Design a binder for this molecule. Structure first.
Ligand code: CDL
Ligand code: PCF
Ligand code: PCF
Ligand code: PEF
Ligand code: PEF
Ligand code: PEF
Ligand code: HEM
Ligand code: HEM
Ligand code: HEM
Ligand code: HEM
Ligand code: UQ6
Ligand code: UQ6
Lengths: 49, 62, 126, 57, 93, 385, 385, 126
């Protein structure tokens, strides 16, 4: 495994960048879904026709 | 219940609703996404393109 | 894809038997409570799959007041599940409210379709 | 002001996208040196440059 | 193009559900809301509610198959040792 | 009209990605389809760039993979991405097919969509097997002479088929060179059946975890499920990167780093881990002809599901007997896989023959009987008489 | 409704090859499109079966083609079918593009359909070039040297692009294995762009030789043009079989039976015959950068046609001057190919420079000027003013 | 793509010059005879491309009786071309019948379109 030293260094940049992208994606998803998540329905039965 | 009576949204609303402050906050979180994604796309296209350059054994016979 | 005529035929034999009713009905009541569709504000008749001609006929003949109410219970259940919560306990459907409102329309439509199949395969004697 | 901050960076998309790219150029350069510097110090006394010094002194 | 067969979904404006009357809906803009609201409360109390109602359907089947695997693995270790060489003859042949 | 709807090409994009009406209550299990399309793109792109440095000759195949790892710039990344990516392909696919089984996505209006997926599953197994032979390690060589030799059990012209498949008298240079040509082709057939997969889904749309109609509340796909799918894309990419840079050989077999030798046989011969459950089914039958029929039937019994289900409710959400037995079948599948990695000894032979029976009894006995029982309980529990 | 109209998959077949409404006036020139579909199928199937016996190493590439001819059963049939089939591919495509140029099929309603065809033309030229290099004869090695060395004329980044394309310092082993992998892939891109070709044709339908609307008289595709396409399908294989069994090397170059040698120049270096017209345009400009740019212009000027045609009538059926100058362009194209296979001599240098000017002046000068003159002649020839 | 307004502007100037009308018209009559559309039963106005918005309004406003005749001449030419023959010499369109019947409906539709464009780019002299 002659690439062992360089492979482990490159894995440190991947995980840090990908962990911060995953967390930033949860916030963006929750911001776009706020209107649907907090939505209220009421029902007034219509009078007979 | 009249349809003119809106339900209670108090426990999900911001208590200070500023347009400029509340927009700069949201755009700064999508800019951070677009900054890191643009950085990760550069490292992806460079990885594939560079594999098409001269290999180690070929470079030894220069 | 078992017909409701078959379910009713088996179910009635249990209810008219005094021995079987005392041993099977208590189990069915606990089965329904554990299913937990009432905690989403739904009756069982709202859960029946509707993408067949028999159930499209029955839903057409349902009165307007019942049809409007059913559409509200279904919309409310989709939004409650969206949030990964349950309804408040006072909004749950009671046992006395979980009645088979659509069943008579389903059985009437099923009896008509069976008689049509028995007349298309008719054979005249003598 | 938050109003002048919006009018300068977030009103036009030509400035919002251009700022994101300019911040990606800087992040790329600095992030590489920081990771290499930390990685090479966690492994002191084991790299070839350290070993090369022990056979020259 | 020619029209196709009848389906069970339509499009915006003719989706094909029942006729709706008497239902009102309200919603607020996300720019005036607080995302992440209540995450700490939900991370403990909602998670315990969901876990308690489903863990028996998953763990009882899991524990049945895990006991079977360990018992059958321990028996194999007994037959291929010096202590159980006599039984290995009868059971095998 | 908007240009995204009047244009001939943009209309297809709009109708499938932007404006597609989706049920509002679909949970995170509905994100596996988009992940499976990212896995297919990852495999194809990495495979093509590796194919610029590969030689399929039986005396050059093993050494060309080392030339990729050692001499090609970023070559080990491409190889570890491609090798681990195929293992993550089958993880997602296995749980993509388990969502449809739990929620009853195979029922009447979507029977054709279910059947096309079974075809895609068959083609993916063949593609992975063909690429594993292209390394020509000890497991690669010896795994091919126990799979291709299965067809010799056909009563008539069974031996003529294996000769035509081998190109000679055993696994040799003709076999390895033709297996690479087929490993290049089948992925493009898979891409064509995915489009047919999406075409059959667009008729009635997708289902929902409640099992009822979703025509009363819909939201467009764009800006709601585009951003919800980005959450699992970044999570899928993080876990794979952990397996590529920090543990690139955990899911492999160390015997495939020995060059293939037809004269020395390894102690234990097994396929990759995602083919182990079907391998254990094949070994259970003490006959060669019936064993290969039984192993192939294990993929074809998925097609009887729309007819053996007798419930008037679609899904397992509100059923307690069906929920319990669904996880008996799931943990039976794991036990089948573990038996396939074991030796042929005293206790493991009987265990495999029982777990094989439970596999087929679930589709043909348990589901029809349980579905009928729950139909009656739902009736006598509310109809007072 | 009929099952052929209600099914999800059959309805795409019915709408394209069964119930498609076609004009009743289209002649046999409207048969080249279906022939190009058969050519693409022939090339893919013969290439795949040949790829099971081929090695892309630069030390084994030439000998693997000789192995196919001699040792593989019916292997010479596959090779001569693939080599001659590619020559017939460009024959039909040249006539397919000249049909639409004569009948004004590029005009307003169908500009998108015309633009997709130009993309297919570019990809097919690249595919044929890449496969010629895979034989590794004396004309394929030295042809690849001149073609790939023209990218070095790009400013600043030119020299780096050549090294990235070669994979080294000259045309070597990395280049040959590079080109076989791309030769396998590009035909699948063509097949996907052919489907986009048919999608853009379906919006407005085909045109007719008269150049007027065809909405007043239509006949279905099935049983009227299915059997009319079968007439030219049988004639197509008859002429191909003549060249495959009785004259398989008439369209080739004898110098490609000498194995590639980087140390001996093969005297005159020329590409295959269908690329010769574009080779003469490149050599007519005494400047590498300008001469290279002009070579891709000759394919990109075809996009200017829908805007330099100032005629109110579609087609050349009733136009006197446009009919005459159309055949001047056609035979100008043939003379350009002859110059491309000639040496750099005293008369031939100026002959190719003037013929290059006529090629470009046709789109930009002749067509606009002629089409305006005929508009007036139609007017003043019947108005009493 | 060249507008009929521009075509008529050049043509009318030629037809009013005594010298220019003497050499251009005789070669224009021979050009039309060699074109050969009259031998299929067609007038020139039937050959104009109709897939533009301008020519769609002209065909809409054409009187009903003239529109029925045009449909017959177009269908007749498609059938004649299908057989690779010509019409009998007595069925050919004569010179006095090859009149520009649709020309006034095109020049009027084009003038209206030109005025609209000039009014969307109006500039008040403030
Ligand atoms: C992919 C297709 C994108 C799409 O849907 O575009 C149609 C869309 C038209 O939207 P629509 O409401 O469906 O059409 C209304 C009408 O077509 C009327 O549309 P319109 O009047 O708004 O169209 C004007 C448009 C005309 O559009 C074009 O010519 C498209 C450009 C193609 C080249 O010309 C421009 O204003 C484009 C120049 C400004 C964009 C600068 C961005 C630079 C890089 C970022 O046009 C644009 O998005 C314009 C931007 C062009 C490309 C930006 C990059
Ligand atoms: C590959 C990775 C490339 C990442 C690029 C990310 C990026 O540049 O996003 C910038 C914009 C922002 O998108 P936005 O949310 O619509 O911005 C709001 C518009 N304001 C109000 C600010 C004017 O997003 C876009 O303009 C669309 C980018 C789509 C990719
Ligand atoms: C274990 C993880 C922490 C659990 C702490 C907890 O559950 O305490 C309850 C509060 C709930 O706080 P919350 O979930 O963010 O809701 C806020 C909305 N209020 C209530 C203001 C109307 O939680 C808190 O606000 C305190 C959380 C602070 C600790 C964070 C790091 C640990
Ligand atoms: C189209 C096919 C795309 C395949 C994507 C597969 C993703 C699976 C996750 C595995 C990690 C990435 C694979 C190796 C790529 C790489 O280069 O990772 C190494 C880089 C840093 O390395 P470096 O720049 O320092 O060295 C490079 C050698 N000079 O890490 C990252 O920036 C992770 C960021 C990933 C975000 C990518 C977003 C998608 C872009 C699409 C275009
Ligand atoms: C993410 C989680 C992924 C779960 C599956 C990962 C496979 C385990 C490592 C495989 C490689 C390996 O290590 O070798 C193979 C391992 C080792 O078995 P052994 O001890 O007999 O080897 C002997 C050592 N001398 O056997 C197994 O795989 C067990 C079989 C797994 C059962 C199949 C699972 C099918 C359902 C999948 C559901 C999850 C999706
Ligand atoms: C359909 C036809 C499309 C038009 C073809 C473009 C011109 C052909 C190149 C002619 C040429 O370059 O030469 C002619 C070539 C090779 O003959 P030659 O070059 O050796 O000698 C040239 C002596 N004057 O004949 C061919 O290959 C036959 C090609 C088949 C065409 C029918
Ligand atoms: C490469 C392989 C596959 C791809 C790319 C793919 C893609 C998709 C996508 C995008 C969806 C819609 C979104 C979703 O439900 O997640 C879907 C749904 C579905 N797929 Fe697949 N799929 C694949 C394989 C399979 C297989 C193997 C099966 C079954 C054996 C299958 C059966 C289904 C079913 C039943 C649905 C509808 C489920 C529902 O909406 O309730 N698919 N698929
Ligand atoms: C669904 C798509 C694909 C799957 C599931 C797949 C699967 C595999 C697997 C399992 C291996 C074995 C690797 C190992 O065990 O180390 C492999 C090897 C290989 N595959 Fe693929 N493959 C796919 C697509 C492709 C394509 C399209 C190509 C080429 C165009 C390709 C080229 C290769 C090559 C060259 C190898 C050589 C061995 C190696 O590099 O490890 N693959 N493939
Ligand atoms: C593999 C390559 C191609 C295939 C399979 C193909 C296929 C077809 C087919 C089947 C048709 C309808 C039948 C016919 O008109 O004969 C057609 C029409 C057409 N094609 Fe192609 N084509 C190809 C390449 C091209 C190229 C290179 C061009 C132009 C540069 C082009 C331009 C056109 C045009 C303009 C039409 C419509 C002509 C009309 O209907 O009047 N195509 N094509
Ligand atoms: C539109 C599709 C294709 C075209 C136009 C094309 C064209 C060519 C040409 C002109 C040659 C040179 C042969 C000679 O001069 O003797 C060639 C060679 C070759 N091609 Fe293709 N090709 C196509 C598709 C394919 C495909 C899909 C494959 C493999 C999957 C393939 C595999 C080969 C091989 C192995 C050779 C080796 C040389 C020989 O056998 O003659 N081709 N191709
Ligand atoms: C007359 O009407 C028609 C018309 O019918 C058609 C077809 C077309 C053509 C249209 C097309 C879109 C072309 C269709 C073709 C493609 C897009 C590409 C074709 C693709 C292939 C041939 C790939 C198939 C390859 C294989 C099966 C591989 C062969 C290898 C095998 C079998 C290996 C052997 C197996 C084992 C296990 C050893 C027309 O243009 C047309 O006019 C309107
Ligand atoms: C609508 O709901 C969906 C959905 O249905 C699906 C399937 C997915 C997931 C996947 C897709 C949409 C894509 C489906 C995948 C395919 C059809 C596979 C097709 C294959 C490719 C796109 C890859 C092709 C790549 C190449 C040809 C590149 C090869 C490299 C080259 C040419 C470089 C070499 C260059 C030189 C110069 C030598 C979703 O994300 C999604 O939500 C939006």
């Amino acid at each position: 495994e002659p690439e062992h030293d360089e492979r482990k260094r490159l894995g440190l940049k991947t995980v840090i960048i990908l962990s911060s992208l995953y967390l930033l994606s949860i916030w963006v998803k929750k911001f776009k879904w706020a209107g649907i998540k907090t939505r209220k329905f009421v029902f007034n039965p219509p009078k007979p026709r | 219940k009249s349809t003119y009576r809106t339900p209670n949204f108090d426990d999900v609303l911001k208590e200070n609703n500023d347009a400029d402050k509340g927009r700069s906050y949201a755009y700064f979180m999508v800019g951070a996404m677009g900054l890191l994604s643009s950085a990760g796309a550069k490292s992806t296209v460079e990885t594939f393109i560079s594999s098409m350059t001269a290999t180690a054994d070929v470079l030894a016979m220069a | 894809p078992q017909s409701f005529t078959s379910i009713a035929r088996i179910g009635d034999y249990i209810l008219k038997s005094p021995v079987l009713s005392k041993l099977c009905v208590p189990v069915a009541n606990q089965f329904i409570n554990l299913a937990g569709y009432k905690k989403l504000g739904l009756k069982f008749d709202d859960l029946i799959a509707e993408e067949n001609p028999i159930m499209q006929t029955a839903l057409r003949r349902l009165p307007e007041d019942e049809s409007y109410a059913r559409a509200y219970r279904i919309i409310r259940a989709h939004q409650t599940e969206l949030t990964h919560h349950l309804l408040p306990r006072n909004e749950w459907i009671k046992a006395q409210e979980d009645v088979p409102y659509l069943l008579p329309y389903i059985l009437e439509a099923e009896a008509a379709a069976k008689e049509k199949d028995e007349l298309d395969n008719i054979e005249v004697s003598k | 002001s938050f109003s002048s901050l919006y009018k300068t960076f977030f009103k036009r998309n030509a400035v919002f996208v251009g700022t994101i790219f300019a911040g990606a150029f800087v992040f790329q350069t600095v992030f590489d040196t920081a990771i290499t510097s930390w990685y090479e110090n966690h492994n002191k006394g084991k790299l070839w440059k350290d070993v090369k010094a022990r056979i020259a002194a | 193009g020619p029209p196709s067969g009848k389906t069970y979904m339509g499009w915006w404006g003719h989706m094909g559900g029942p006729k709706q009357k008497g239902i009102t809906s309200y919603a607020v803009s996300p720019y005036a809301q607080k995302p992440l609201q209540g995450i700490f409360h939900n991370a403990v109390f909602n998670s315990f509610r969901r876990f308690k109602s489903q863990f028996l359907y998953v763990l009882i089947p899991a524990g049945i198959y895990w006991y079977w695997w360990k018992n059958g693995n321990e028996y194999n270790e007994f037959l291929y040792s010096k202590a159980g060489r006599e039984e290995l003859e009868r059971v095998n042949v | 009209m908007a240009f995204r709807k009047s244009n001939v090409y943009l209309s297809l994009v709009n109708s499938y990605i932007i404006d597609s009406p989706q049920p509002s209550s679909i949970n995170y299990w509905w994100n596996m389809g988009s992940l499976l399309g990212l896995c297919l793109v990852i495999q194809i792109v990495t495979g093509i760039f590796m194919a610029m440095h590969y030689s399929s000759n039986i005396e050059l195949a093993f050494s060309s993979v080392e030339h990729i790892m050692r001499d090609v710039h970023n070559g080990y990344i491409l190889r570890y991405l491609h090798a681990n990516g195929a293992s993550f392909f089958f993880m997602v696919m296995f749980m993509h097919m388990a969502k449809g089984l739990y929620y009853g996505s195979y029922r009447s209006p979507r029977v054709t969509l279910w059947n096309v997926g079974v075809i895609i599953f068959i083609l993916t197994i063949a593609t992975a097997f063909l690429g594993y032979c292209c390394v020509y390690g000890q497991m690669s060589h010896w795994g091919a002479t126990v799979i291709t030799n299965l067809f010799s059990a056909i009563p008539f012209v069974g031996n003529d088929i294996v000769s035509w498949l081998w190109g000679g008298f055993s696994v040799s240079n003709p076999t390895i060179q033709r297996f690479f040509a087929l490993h290049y082709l089948v992925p493009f057939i898979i891409a064509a059946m995915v489009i047919m997969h999406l075409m059959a889904l667009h008729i009635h749309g997708s289902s929902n975890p409640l099992g009822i109609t979703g025509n009363l509340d819909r939201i467009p796909m764009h800006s709601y499920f585009i951003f919800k799918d980005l959450v699992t894309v970044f999570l899928f990419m993080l876990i794979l990167a952990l397996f590529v840079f920090y543990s690139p050989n955990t899911l492999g077999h160390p015997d495939n780093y020995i060059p293939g030798n037809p004269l020395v046989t390894p102690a234990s011969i097994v396929p990759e881990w995602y083919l182990l459950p079907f391998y254990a089914i094949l070994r259970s039958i003490p006959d060669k002809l019936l064993g290969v029929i039984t192993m192939f039937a294990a993929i074809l019994v998925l097609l009887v599901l729309p007819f053996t289900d007798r419930s008037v409710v679609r899904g397992n959400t509100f059923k307690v007997l069906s929920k319990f037995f669904f996880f008996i079948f799931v943990f039976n599948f794991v036990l089948l896989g573990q038996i396939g990695a074991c030796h042929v000894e005293v206790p493991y032979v009987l265990m495999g023959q029982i777990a094989t029976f439970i596999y087929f009894a679930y589709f043909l006995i348990i589901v029809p009987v349980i579905s009928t029982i729950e139909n009656v309980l739902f009736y006598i529990g509310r109809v007072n008489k």
